[PDB]
Symmetry: C6
Subunit: 192 residues, 6 copies
């Protein structure tokens, strides 16, 4: 683990070291050591005021098609890949940190992909969960529930706090990446 | 784990680097980090509208003869085996260019991976009549009286991860197929 | 773990190594060895005297918007971040423990940030939980609970003991950090 | 992990290295990462159609005197012991100096065949075959007359049982092959 | 000797191996599925406590810890004497220590083996336990979880423990044969 | 882990290595491999003969204000702290027999270990009125009506492990005290 952090650390620019702390210290550690157990009882303590068998199963599924923690884990995997794909290609090309030559296209594309992956996952969070605040009460009318059934979410306030934290840090990583693009564009295209 | 990956990563060709990345970061990490706890309550939260004792047991067993995550773990072990068999056999002969007797092993090893990957993709489709999980399963196996209604836990999340794994597996098939294109053009056309 | 502790402790001053012992041995170890499993049944054995569905969910959420251990985990991440940020920037300059030059500004700011983070989290603990004692009984009247219902907290006394222990150690870490600022401000501002 | 596997790998014959992969990657991995959790709810989800207290306890105990995964773990420990003994004895033999190897190596292979066959035999006799039934009928005290009990995940347990039995049979053939190679050179080679 | 290191350490690793990867999960549900035919609150708590004052696996864990110490105490005494002599520079004494540690291991192995027999009046676990401790009214029938699997692992641990007694005794008599001769 | 164990093992006196083996193999290993699973169901299997909601919660809290394993975990951290702090203070001077300035720190570290062990042993006695756990506790705290009967989980096993930890701690106190005599007899002879 130290080698992986050190290996990525030694092959990054000035801001590329700041970006690595924001990813490991906050996105990963908070997801692992603080937020994973907040969502542990997400369906166990989902409570619906009904006597209909199977009503709770389909109402929880309707309102949480994918868990927040599963969405964040997918985002972290998608974002860490370009940062390490450029390293694996570097080892291959070297076998056969300033930016020059062919590495310029790979590094710039990797920065571009992370911005796209960041914004896409942030947009999925907003659209799917119609905001970043979790409600105490959800009203569900999917079959087999009769009419509209009241259901109550487990730990809505604590999940809102961690949702705001994850979204805000993701926005910071967006700003740090578009800034790095500006520096590369100034040095290369505006440098001419 | 880091040492094991380093051995496989070093002894690979140009495409084999991309294939190794797709295998570890996607097949393994999603299965371990994100998919494993989705299937945690597959039978605990399986709910059947009945009063018949034992009806839930036979009904869950009918519609899920093997879990999705258990089927994916078997696929990973079978796919990862030819890669490590090549390394073990190569180290034995010592006691990346492809030439000599190692050519027959490498070409065969990739061929097995396509067979294993497509076979497990076929079993997924046949056993689960598609890649989309349903909310409701109807059930008439003994001792369930007539047809009973049963409800699946987290069907939408399970579909999302199923679609992801099938799509990534399809990518791995194409990468292995293109290897046989760059190996037969070197041999048959040369 | 040994390398990370070995890396941080080497690049530290006299008191700054005492501060590392109070952080690792007491804040981290108490949190993960003892305190974490004290809070494991926090909502499972939250008991409310009522027959209203969903009333337990909203009353627990009202009185524990975020768990104590989750608050402490976030505090430890924030407090330890400036120390590691200094280490990462130090390697940046060397590839490009007396305090001199421009390293003075980074070290002094890192100490200042840690005091602010420590006091902020200590302030949030007091405001959110109206003191450092956990009560046996909470009275809750949030919807959909009818009138006011009686709810009972799990292990309030053990949680009070660990809450006092964490606050006291955090206050000690504040005192050590303030002392270090006094030493540095003697050299520079009092020197003039 | 890497060191223990690496140590046993370096001191082995041509076939014996094929035996190492078929033991670790398949016996241990399927047992650890796929099969152990399948048996996790074996008694929790065991359901008996009765109102008699204590009837579920004795019926499960009657039909599962020892769990499949516990039986496989014991077999893996016993099968891997002769290889462990050889390495420990070989290190001691080197220290004493600071033919004989042939006798220990042949005997270790012999014990592995006996241990594999004995455990495979116990699986057959104890569970009257390799297929798990959905319904067991139990009349042990204190169950009144005969009660119906339902097994948890019988189909998934059958799939893994068939898998471990088949891999074990392959191991027996590999050890027999190595046993014949040594016999032909020494006894028939006179 | 050959039995002194190879056989004794392998049997020790075997006992640890059984305890962790096999035995621990067998006892994980000992009180959860302890079932008593009664309606008396607290009756199940005191009946389980009466018949299982300490769990089998917890007793085995104490055995393996106590059996390990005489060897470890020998190493500390041996290493300290060598280093202290080496630093000062900058057999006969060991023999009375080595034979003592072997003697202690026999004593510990037999003492724990005897405790197993007396505490559980045998090595076979029963399906049914009859309990009459307060507050249970009259005698209450209670049912043990997985008694057959627990008997199989008990036999495995006892038999391996008894072999270690014979191996330790064999080495002890071997030294005392030479010492007298 | 071997670095931590090796570090303390290397820098210790003749008796200081005996105290080290009785702390790891017995205090730590038994707390980790045997004791923590004994206390796992301490409140889940705590049973009270009542129909009053919340009565079980306050009765368990009254009679077990802090768990035995949590009290032991705190004691181990406090007892092991001075032994480590010697190394950190020693390594500080090294990169910048007992004699010199080390004599005052080592003697003080021994002194704190005895005080911490005695304080925690005293807390165990005062808080839990002896070292034997009872099967039945009578509780009358609000909201329990009158006095209710509550039954502890695994009281005999907990008593067995409680006796073992107290006995080993008393052995540790004697070992620390005997090292307080070897150091003091040398200076007393000098006086
Ligand atoms: C970065 C952290 C951002 C924290 C604020 C985001 C969450 C907004 C809701 C909020 O603050 O809730 C309040 C409690 O605050 C809290 O509990 C805030 C705790 C933050 C501590 C620092 C981390 C009480 O508002 P409410 O009870 O009406 O909330 C119902 C909505 N879920
Ligand atoms: C790889 C991409 C996987 C997503 C596409 C396939 C999944 C199809 C299911 C789907 O669209 O579900 C919707 C939610 O989408 C989702 O939950 C998609 C989230 C994707 C996040 C990024 C990966 C709403 O589902 P519905 O309301 O129609 O459900 C009723 C039937 N289950
Ligand atoms: C340092 C930590 C100890 C100082 C704070 C102790 C606060 C809790 C306290 O006083 O609890 C009393 C018993 O003390 C204790 O249980 C003190 C235990 C100290 C153990 C050593 C660490 C019970 O007092 P109460 O019955 O009024 O509790 C009302 C709460 N629900
Ligand atoms: C290794 C491959 C093992 C394949 C054979 C195992 C299954 C044999 C029993 C069988 O015919 O299963 C029937 C359908 O099979 C199935 O549908 C089994 C699915 C096989 C998946 C293989 C993936 C590799 C269920 O019929 P049943 O009710 O008798 O099942 C048992 C519960 N009683
Ligand atoms: C070394 C292994 C020795 C196992 C001894 C088993 C004695 C218990 C016994 O009578 O087992 C009967 C069948 O055993 C079995 O069917 C299990 C035999 C051991 C399996 C293979 C171990 C390797 C069950 O019959 P019972 O009702 O008398 O059981 C008595 C338990 N309470
Ligand atoms: C270190 C050894 C500690 C042994 C002393 C602890 C047990 C003393 C209490 C006692 O008399 O226990 C009775 C039977 O003891 C027993 O049978 C205790 C067995 C301890 C075996 C230790 C082997 C190592 C059970 O009766 P009780 O009701 O007094 O039990 C106490 C809970 N109420």
């Amino acid at each position: 683990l130290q080698t992986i952090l050190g290996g990525v650390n030694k092959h990054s620019t000035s801001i590329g070291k700041i970006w690595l702390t924001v990813l490991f210290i906050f996105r990963i550690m908070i997801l692992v050591v603080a937020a994973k157990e907040v969502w542990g009882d997400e369906q166990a303590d989902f409570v619906c005021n009904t006597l209909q068998p199977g009503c709770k199963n389909v109402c929880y599924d309707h309102y949480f098609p994918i868990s927040h923690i599963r969405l964040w884990a997918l985002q972290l995997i998608f974002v860490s890949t370009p940062a390490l794909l450029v390293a694996m290609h570097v080892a291959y090309r070297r076998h056969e940190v300033r930016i020059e030559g062919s590495l310029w296209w790979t590094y710039t594309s990797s920065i571009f992909f992370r911005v796209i992956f960041e914004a896409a996952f942030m947009y999925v969070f907003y659209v799917m969960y119609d905001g970043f605040s979790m409600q105490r009460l959800v009203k569900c009318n999917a079959w087999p529930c009769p009419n509209t059934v009241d259901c109550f979410v487990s730990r809505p306030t604590e999940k809102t706090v961690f949702t705001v934290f994850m979204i805000a840090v993701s926005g910071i990583c967006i700003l740090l990446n578009v800034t790095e693009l500006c520096y590369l564009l100034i040095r290369y295209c505006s440098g001419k």
